[PDB]
């Protein structure tokens, strides 16, 4: 965190298209490729997006991403209960000489049984 800015929380109902933003600067997002991943802390990340907008193998086509200037966005179409997780953005930062990270966005899916 703190290099990239992500909202702390995001929520939606089943079937909605929800977007998660990630904002940076010329030295990170502006010049280098963005990655998106889901992670439970202390476990290896599940990669969702690489090279700004490409889907790796095995990832659902409900996911998409874009990058414009110093901002990046992750879109989830057809929100499903299984989508509840913590989402992070990352990119190489020329100022750090290593990767920079967002703080993570907890996505909550409403309308599930209690």
Binding residues vs its own copies (CB under 8 A): 35, 37-48, 50-51, 54, 56-59, 92, 98-99
CB of 58 to its own copies, least distance (A): 5
Contact (Cβ atoms closer than 8 angstroms) between residue 105 and residue 6? yes
87 closest CA partner among 100, 75, 99, 71: 75
| Nearer to its own copies among residue 43 and residue 114 (C-beta) | 43
| Nearer to its own copies among residue 27 and residue 114 (C-beta) | 27
CB of 113 to its own copies, least distance (A): 25
Cα 104 to Cα 22, 24, 58, 97, 114: the distances in Å are 9, 14, 23, 21, 25
CB of 66 to its own copies, least distance (A): 17
| Nearer to its own copies among residue 63 and residue 113 (C-beta) | 63
Give the largest Cα separation in the chain, rounded.
46
CB of 35 to its own copies, least distance (A): 8
- Token pair of 86, please? 């913590």
Q: How many residues does the chain have?
A: 114
| Nearer to its own copies among residue 18 and residue 85 (C-beta) | 85
């Amino acid at each position: 965190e703190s290099v990239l800015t992500q909202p702390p929380s995001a929520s939606g109902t089943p079937g909605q298209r929800v977007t998660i933003s990630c904002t940076g600067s010329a030295t990170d997002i502006g010049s280098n490729s963005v990655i998106w991943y889901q992670q439970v802390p202390g476990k290896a990340p599940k990669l969702l997006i690489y090279y700004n907008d490409l889907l790796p193998s095995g990832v659902s086509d409900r996911f998409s991403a874009s990058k414009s200037g110093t901002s990046a966005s992750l879109a989830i179409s057809g929100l499903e209960s299984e989508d509840e997780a913590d989402y992070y953005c990352a990119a190489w930062n020329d100022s750090l000489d290593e990767p920079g990270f967002g703080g993570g966005t907890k996505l909550t899916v409403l309308g599930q049984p209690k």
